[PDB]
Structure formats: C-alpha cells, structure tokens
Design a binder for this molecule. Sequence first.
Ligand SMILES: [Zn+2]
Length: 28
Amino acid sequence: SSDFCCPKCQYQAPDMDTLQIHVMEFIE
Ligand SMILES: [Zn+2]
C-alpha cells in the first residue's frame, strides 16, 4: 500500500505523518 489506513476508520492517508495528524495520537 502506498498509503496508511486508519485502524479506526476506512480513511487512508497518503503519508504516515498525515495519518498521525488524522488520528492525533490515541487512547492506547
Ligand atoms: Zn481515524
């Protein structure tokens, strides 16, 4: 995969930093 999918959503981010901004850390 040329993307990083959010394990909480069906949303996939083109970059891992973008995904990190999407999730904005976790409760885990
Ligand atoms: Zn998410």
